[PDB]
C-alpha cells in the first residue's frame, strides 16, 4: 500500500 520512496 505504501508508495516506494528512499529512506
Amino acid at each position, epitope marked *: *500500500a*505504501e*508508495f*516506494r*520512496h*528512499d*529512506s
Partner: antibody
Framework: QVTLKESGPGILKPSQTLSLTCSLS??????????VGWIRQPSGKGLEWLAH???????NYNPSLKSQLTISKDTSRNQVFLKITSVDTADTATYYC???????????????WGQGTLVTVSA | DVLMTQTPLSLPVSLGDQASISCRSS???????????LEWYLQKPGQSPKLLIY???NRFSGVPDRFSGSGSGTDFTLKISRVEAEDLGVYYC?????????FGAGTKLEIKR
C-alpha cells in the same frame, strides 16, 4: 531539454485495447531511482493516477483498474508504454505521462509533465 | 484509498487578496521514511498541471514565495497572500505516500464580482 511526449490512437471503440507510448528524452529511466508514469483526466474533471514503472521493473497500479492496466518499458530506445484492455466511454480522457523519482535528488515529485494526448473511446 | 478532501471546491476572490485552501486526507500520509509527500498542483485551462509545493511546505523552483503550504499529518493548507491573475486556475492537493496515489477534486480559483 527534458521532455515527455505522449502518443495515442486519438480514437478507438469500446471493448477494444488502448496502446499508449511516451517518448522520454533529457533523461533515462535507466538511471537508478528513476521512474515514469501515467495519469489521466476526463474532459473537465479530476486527475486519476493509473500506473508507475521503476527503473528496476517494479510496477504499481490503481486497485480500481488492476485487470485492465499493463505498464511496460524499453530502456535504450527510451520509451514507456501503457495499455488498457476492454476500454469504454468512461476511459475517454486526456492521458499524461509524468516523471517521478523515489529518491531526493532526482526529484521525488511530479515536476515534469508531457503536454498530454486525447484518447476518446467512441463507437 | 486515501481520499483528499479539498474545501472549498470553489473559491471566489479579489485581485490582491489573501486566499486559503484546506486539504484533508482521510488517513495519515506520513511515510515510514519520515516524509509527508503532500504536494500541491496548479492547472490552468489548456495546460497540464504544474508542481507548486512538495513535502507540504517546500516551494518548487521558480514558484513565487506568496504561495505557502502549511500543515501536518492529515490537515494541510495552501495559502496565497496576494492573489494575481496568473494564479487563477484549478488547485489540486495530492498524496504520494499511499498507493493508490490520489488527488483531491480541485479547488477552482475563480474571481468574484
Amino acid at each position: 531539454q527534458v521532455t515527455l511526449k505522449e502518443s495515442g490512437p486519438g480514437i478507438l471503440k469500446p471493448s477494444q485495447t488502448l496502446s499508449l507510448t511516451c517518448s522520454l528524452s533529457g533523461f533515462s529511466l535507466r538511471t537508478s531511482g528513476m521512474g515514469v508514469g501515467w495519469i489521466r483526466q476526463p474532459s473537465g474533471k479530476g486527475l486519476e493516477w493509473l500506473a508507475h514503472i521503476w527503473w528496476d521493473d517494479d510496477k504499481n497500479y490503481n486497485p480500481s483498474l488492476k485487470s485492465q492496466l499493463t505498464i511496460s518499458k524499453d530502456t535504450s530506445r527510451n520509451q514507456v508504454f501503457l495499455k488498457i484492455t476492454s476500454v469504454d466511454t468512461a476511459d475517454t480522457a486526456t492521458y499524461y505521462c509524468v516523471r517521478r523519482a523515489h529518491n531526493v535528488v532526482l526529484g521525488d515529485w511530479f515536476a515534469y509533465w508531457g503536454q498530454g494526448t486525447l484518447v476518446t473511446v467512441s463507437a | 484509498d486515501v481520499l483528499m478532501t479539498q474545501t472549498p471546491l470553489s473559491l471566489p476572490v479579489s485581485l490582491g487578496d489573501q486566499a486559503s485552501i484546506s486539504c484533508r486526507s482521510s488517513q495519515s500520509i506520513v511515510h515510514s521514511n519520515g516524509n509527508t509527500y503532500l504536494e500541491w498542483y496548479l492547472q490552468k485551462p489548456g495546460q497540464s498541471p504544474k508542481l507548486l509545493i512538495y513535502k507540504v511546505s517546500n516551494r518548487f523552483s521558480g514558484v513565487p514565495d506568496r504561495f505557502s503550504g502549511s500543515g501536518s499529518g492529515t490537515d494541510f493548507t495552501l495559502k496565497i497572500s496576494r492573489v494575481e491573475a496568473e494564479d487563477l486556475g484549478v488547485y489540486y492537493c495530492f498524496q504520494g505516500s499511499h498507493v493508490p496515489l490520489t488527488f483531491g477534486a480541485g479547488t477552482k480559483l475563480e474571481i468574484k464580482r
